Amino acid sequence: MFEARLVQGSILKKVLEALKDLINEACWDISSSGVNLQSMDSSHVSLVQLTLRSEGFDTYRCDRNLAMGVNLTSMSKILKCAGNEDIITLRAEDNADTLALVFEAPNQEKVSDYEMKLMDLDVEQLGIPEQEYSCVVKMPSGEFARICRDLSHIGDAVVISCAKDGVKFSASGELGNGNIKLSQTSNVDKEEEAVTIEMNEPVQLTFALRYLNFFTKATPLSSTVTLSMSADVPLVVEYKIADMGHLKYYLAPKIED
């Protein structure tokens, strides 16, 4: 039996909006430490890793470890029926044939109970090592979303160059080319508003903008985004879900022979 009660239901909603368009089906690993999820997209070019720690929920209880196969479109449909101020409780039986979602509205006269059917999925999961990256950029998530969307007008691929003093984003297509240069913030007043770069060696990689525009759907989860780059290693785009966990998108680069 698994039961977790989360007062800020909006977080769950945003998570599902950050996943439903990239991957259709995913296995949720429930354990005493919390909720974990990992899935590549259908093309295997990108990967999503979600972690929601038990300490982040208002109440958490997991007796035996569970693996719930979920169609993410169905779960997002169910969660759109929740309000941003609802208290959301997830519950599953020991056999866990279905997953129950209880939404307690802020009107205090409305309680909703949804029962989502679960299925048995055989998902390909990868071993992601914990490593140190040659270049790390921390920037406002909205600025990053705007950059990816804007450069999608210019071309299909973006070249990210992380250097000591700043980071540059490059796109090229039939109509021409463009470069956006974000210098390291000189007057760091609000840490959420700043561009900071931690570098060991400068890094330069090429990525597909369609996947990045899928990634940026996590923007409502965090005011900042962190991009981690090493040479010929897939890039990591990290949104921290405050005081609970994170959502990480991994993107394989386009490499010249």
């Binding site: 295997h44 999961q125 071993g127 290693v233 897939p234 394989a252």
Partner: peptide, 13 residues
Amino acid sequence: RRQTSMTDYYHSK
């Protein structure tokens, strides 16, 4: 000149 896959870097397991 080639889009790589996540499996080109990480093993499945």
